[PDB]
């Protein structure tokens, strides 16, 4: 019958579901936030639609929770040890990935929005720019998704 | 950076293989493993003890040598301007080679206790051969280090004197009594790596 | 694959297995192995078995001119440090016609849920050595792939195996921890010499 | 097999181990310093650098 | 039965929970508190509305405090191995998320109050900016609960 | 037969895949976007123009993912351990070599686009040289596709 | 019955919430005695208003000594290895959360004390800030206490 | 006879050979595309000769795909270890030359693209280095082919 | 009878004690000595009044020397498990507790005789936050006082 | 009769005959090159006098394939111990006496050519100093020669 | 009889003779050699004696090669490991000797020969600085040649 | 009889007294002919005076080289570990002793000479501080004697 330990894998999994993507999330508000803060003084109108960026890396955290506790809610103590590694890579996978997303989200959201202080014309542009880097949230978790329900 | 990069590199490695060796010997229930027993048993006393010896003359010589270069080195530029510091402010470099000599000292007393056995099964070295070969090599980091952290702490508070009393030649009298201070930290390496080593015996 | 000689009791009680066992008299060689491993007629006469004790005994009636005897002594004790029971081999004993021999095998250990593993027993310097004679003896042995299991055993299988082989023998981690100390010295050598440096200009 | 018999594991195990690991770290080592001290090279090329 | 390291890990999970949640709490309290600081020099009336971006680095503390209670209320000498290490999972999944909204927090607290002293419209953007940090230890905790309670 | 550990590797191919084609995508998209962000100020019609370095980073992420749902799909709880080194190898040479080509997309998007907006003269030159940069993930994917089915 | 090795995990709980929480209290007051030092040449009446992050500072080992003896006369020479590994859990939860609090006094109580010689009106909120940096110490001390007692 | 947990090194050959590449080609693309970059403002017209140190870089990829695709069609189930470290040999070989190549081109591209636009005459010179520095690649690839089929 | 390698951690214990008393007494006086020092010439009256800093300090490596005087004087090959690691614990507490001291002594005493060159009335604060660090020293020999002792 | 494995430490010798080689003609070739080309600039008539450094760091790249080749026409299954520890012995004293000379011929060739630029006399002594740098490889090549043919 | 594997230190005693010989003679040679062109273009004329310190670190090189030879000229099939060692120290004796002895080599030749060009007569006191620099690889040699003749 | 690996710690005992020598008596002529080369300009009669800091770095690598003379004749095949780590310790003692005060000589050399140039008074107090620490290289000759003879 299957190892004593096979579960850790797992837990793993589910851990490095919502830690990298909280760290991913985090950076992705940290600049956001640092962008809209020095961009307020010369542009005090732009705070609210420069949220987005926020709004954004919020979304990774998202895709970190999404997956943390569809393995969560998966996890037995029978657990066969492939199912684990299944929830360790889909963890690995969608934190890594949300971790990726929010650099990307974080460097994206500060430069976009203190160039669009400067050019409102940017917002558009930075709005795409940013939809190219959440997506690599969404195939982290797409990815994540698959490997917790084969 | 540079060279900090690769010591990071090489330190943060090491403890992340560290944790992963770590869970992986515990959940996969393998601590009959990593059996710290076997490590301080099968590595030899003598090697153990020598290594105490090499660490107790050359750290406090590393350490002497800091002493040396870090007074030294402010001795001669404040000299520069005021040559009279040569004489007093060799009482800083006296102290630095003190540090040396507690380190001569105790390398050789942890030397004249240390003696072959002709053994080699941890049964018959017994706990006295361990007890030895762990005492003299914990002696040894203690004069060694104690010696270390004083020899650079004489040569900082060294290169002060020397550069206080650049400046004003009543300063250097007064500014010693933190050399003595200083000092007292090889010696308390001493009197402690004595007190270890007391009661050692090998054969 | 041969057959573990089991000994039994109620239930199996030792297990003990080689890819090949042979000995030698006068350093002249012997198979043991098509006389031992899945043998009915294999004459197991006087073995033995106690929860903390076990002695393998195997008779062979052609051997060197004589009846031959080997005897396996293993014992499993409380380690008090690691509140595990560990078993250890502690001794073999060859009895000949008339006379016996002695090998102590240095290194047989591991707790008594697994079975040990290695790849020789033998008191060859070329196999690892672990027959110890502390005098001049006229026989040798070699049990290769030797596995045994001589406490908590669970039907016809070993449990899981401690191998010998581990990751640093005591040579390795006083090689290491000489180079590995003496190497913290070589890269401070080097952190000072590759901060030296050289002015670039001069005086008038 | 059959009878759990173990992974045969040779002797000089540690050795060969300990040759390889301390082998692929050195030369992993000689290579990233190595690769390090050419990537991150000043080109030096001061005559254009600027322009 | 279990084994003799089976509640080490699930402690090591309590532990974790706390100890980097207060990770994260400390750094969101050190650089809010600078900001803080650094503001007051010209706009004394705008403190007791910066502390806000203090406020929520305690409630991350808060987050690591609530699921080390109930791991370390939850733990027993008996433990089945497969508990403990969902337990590991918590105090991680906490921990760690605490560890980076906590971050977000410092940085948006840093940012964010300064950028508030040179114009005091920002304030309801950092509020926002704010709760898309804090909910990061949020969901570290909704994992944590899981986890726990599995 | 397989021992309990094969699939492992296996998956742990399929989170490289997408793990490093998202840090090769993350670092392209964060490299270009500062760029474009930045350029803006001064030539606002070619924000638009711009987009390409972005778009492929975000090709990176595509082929992570095509081969992290093509190893994630071919993996089983039965599978041997020569496919399970197979799928290690085509997640790490699909992942690597997209990160590599992140890195040469996110510098020659950020060196192109600043080039391009003080001369516009080179954007056809950044196209070819950004071909030479995204073709690595391409080549990464060739030998992975490889090594995951043969 | 126990390993005697197993007080080995105790006895770094009781020496980890001691030496963490003892680099807080230092950290804390080097860098809130710093602050204080550099202040009080301009302002020589606030060194007894700014010796209370010091004060707090200092209250940070006392919340490690609290657990580090509680743990210490909870020792004995065969302890069970659950109460042993409560034990390292505890002092490191103290120990490091501890630790968290003196880097949010260190940091805090540097910058609230310049910062209160610019502007005086700080000081009321300062003392919230440092509550929310050493309230940390606290639940650390509250986790430690829960599982040393378990 | 043989061994599993043994077709690992040949794979580890195939994906080094693709991934050291990716990375050598990844340098020499990013650094001579920065090059032709801020090249192109001062001397529009010289792109396409300065272009090739791009395409030098490019071929670095591909000497890694001979080698890795002719590793991967080389491996099989139950490959003998011989085999296996010969294709790990042959992977690195190329793949960590292919990386020196990667630097001696990425480097001498940059500079040589630089300097060519200060003083046209240096094309032909620029031209000569590189094939001295793409030689570099192609000893990799002739040991590798070597080992290979030894 | 106790195992044969019992002694190595107690050992240690003194030989840590001391080691990290040493480190911590070391910096504080250096820290300490440097700013007496450089202060007094331009204060030379004040080098009389500005030892404290420094004895305190020294106190640091009196507190080292006790444990390891107690330590050395109880260790025997004969000695307990147990005890051994007792010693261990004690030796750290003290030693890094005695490292934490010296730094807060360093840092507050050279900033605590800089800031009093310029402002005699600094003089009694400095005093009151170095009690408040060397303190520190006497928590880790209370400690290390109980468990050398239980 | 000989070991499995036994072929690794000889394939290692053939990798490291090789990659430390083309490191150091990458060095050579790449900072030697950007010399070059920085001279060029002032100095049009003197390129193809300049490429001699690169033509030396190039023999270091040859020394490197001459080892390599005959190691890689050396191995076989049987290899005894001795002579693949012969094989990686060569494989490091040519691989890395290579790279010191490549580094040497780097360092030499960059400055002897800008002071061949200001002073046409330099070349001769550019071309005796590179003697020495090259004539390391050929030192290395010797001892490499030797032993893979004890 | 003598172990299996023995031939590897004598082997790295071969290998480090001549690597780190070249590695010092390398270093050597690079730093007088910038020296040498740095100093000629305002004093050609003495390159003819500016050489001699390439020449001593080309000398370093040669105690390499000679120990590596007499080293490889005493490997065998089955060599002792007493022999072996004697050839590993014998190898790194006057290796790495050869190694400190290129830097001083190096760092006095830059200074010495940048000193001559403005003061001639250093030129016969930086003979004799170099001569207590060479000597450190002879005395390299000497132990070297002891040891590998033992 | 002795272990297989016996000689070893003596024959690391014979390197590291002459490479750690070498690197000791390396740097303290580096800095020391740095610093005569530097001096000259200003005053090229100073010189031979001058040598003293060379020549007392030179002597370091002597008593590294009689140490390891003297290991070298007292190595055997028959060593026991005893007499092996014996010349170990002596091998270390004047190994980093040298190493130290080869420090101590260069840093003070390269001080002391420009001192002595424009200060002329400062010669005997070099002379003076050199052989304060020339002495640390005989304090680990005499142990390694002590040891080496035992």
């Known amino acids: ?21 909280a760290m991913g999330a985090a950076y992705g508000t940290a600049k956001s936030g640092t962008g809209i803060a020095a961009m307020s003084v010369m542009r005090p109108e732009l705070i609210m639609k420069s949220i987005i960026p926020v709004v954004m890396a919020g979304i990774i955290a998202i895709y970190g929770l999404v ?34 997303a929010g650099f990307a989200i974080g460097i994206v959201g500060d430069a976009g929005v203190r160039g669009t202080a400067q050019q409102p014309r940017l917002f558009v542009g930075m709005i795409l720019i940013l939809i190219f880097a959440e997506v690599l949230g969404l195939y982290g978790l797409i990815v994540a998704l698959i490997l917790s329900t084969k | 950076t540079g060279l900090e990069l690769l010591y990071l590199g090489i330190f943060v490695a090491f403890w992340a293989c560290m944790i992963v060796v770590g869970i992986c010997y515990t959940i996969f229930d393998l601590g ?69 000599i507690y380190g001569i000292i105790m390398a050789i007393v942890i030397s004249n206790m240390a003696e072959p056995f002709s053994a080699t099964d941890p049964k018959a070295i017994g706990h006295r051969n361990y007890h030895a070969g762990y005492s003299m090599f914990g002696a040894g980091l203690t004069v060694g280090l104690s010696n270390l952290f004083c020899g650079v702490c004489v040569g900082i508070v060294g290169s002060g004197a020397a550069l206080a009393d650049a400046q004003n030649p009543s300063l250097f009298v007064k500014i010693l009594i933190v050399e003595i201070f200083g000092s007292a930290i090889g010696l308390f390496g001493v009197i402690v790596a004595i007190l270890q080593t007391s009661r050692v015996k090998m054969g | 694959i ?65 009846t031959v005897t080997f005897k396996f002594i293993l014992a499993s004790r409380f380690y008090p440090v690691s509140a595990r029971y560990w078993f250890t081999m502690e001794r073999l004993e060859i009895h000949s016609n008339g006379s016996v021999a002695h090998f102590n095998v240095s290194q047989v250990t591991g707790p008594s849920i697994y079975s040990f593993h290695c790849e020789y027993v033998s008191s060859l310097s070329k196999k690892g050595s672990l027959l110890v004679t502390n005098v001049p003896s006229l026989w040798q042995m070699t049990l290769h792939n030797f596995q045994i299991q001589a406490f908590n055993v669970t039907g016809e299988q070993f449990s899981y195996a401690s191998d010998c082989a581990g990751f640093f023998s005591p040579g390795i981690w006083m090689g290491l921890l000489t ?26 | 097999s059959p009878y759990n018999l173990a992974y045969k594991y040779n002797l000089e195990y540690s050795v060969v181990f300990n040759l390889v690991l301390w082998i692929m770290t050195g030369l992993a080592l000689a290579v990233i310093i190595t690769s390090y001290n050419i990537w991150n090279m000043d080109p030096g090329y001061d005559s254009i650098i600027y322009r």
């Open chain 1, 1 to 21: 019958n299957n190892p004593e330990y096979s579960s850790f894998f797992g837990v793993m999994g589910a851990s490095s579901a919502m830690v990298f993507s």
């Open chain 1, 67 to 100: 997956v943390a506790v569809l393995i969560a809610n998966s996890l037995t103590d029978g657990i066969t040890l492939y199912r684990s590694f299944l929830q360790l890579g889909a963890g690995l996978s969608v934190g890594l990935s949300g971790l990726a």
């Open chain 2, 32 to 100: 009959f493993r990593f059996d710290v027993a076997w490590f301080l048993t099968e590595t030899s006393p003598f090697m153990w003890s020598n290594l105490g010896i090499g660490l107790a003359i050359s750290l406090s010589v590393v350490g002497a040598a800091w002493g040396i270069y870090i007074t030294g080195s402010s001795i001669i530029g404040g000299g520069v301007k005021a040559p009279r510091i040569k004489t007093k402010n060799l009482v800083s470099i006296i102290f630095c080679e003190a540090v040396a």
């Open chain 3, 2 to 66: 041969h057959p573990p000689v089991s000994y039994n009791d109620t239930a199996p009680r030792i297990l003990f297995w080689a890819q090949n066992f042979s000995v030698a008299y006068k350093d002249e060689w012997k198979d043991l192995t098509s006389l031992t491993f899945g043998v009915e007629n294999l004459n197991l006469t006087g073995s033995f078995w106690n929860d903390s004790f076990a002695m393998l005994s195997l008779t062979y009636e052609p051997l060197f001119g004589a």
């Open chain 3, 179 to 204: 180079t590995l100390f003496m190497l913290f010295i070589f890269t401070y050598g080097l952190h000072m010499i590759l901060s030296l440096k050289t002015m670039d200009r001069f005086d008038d």
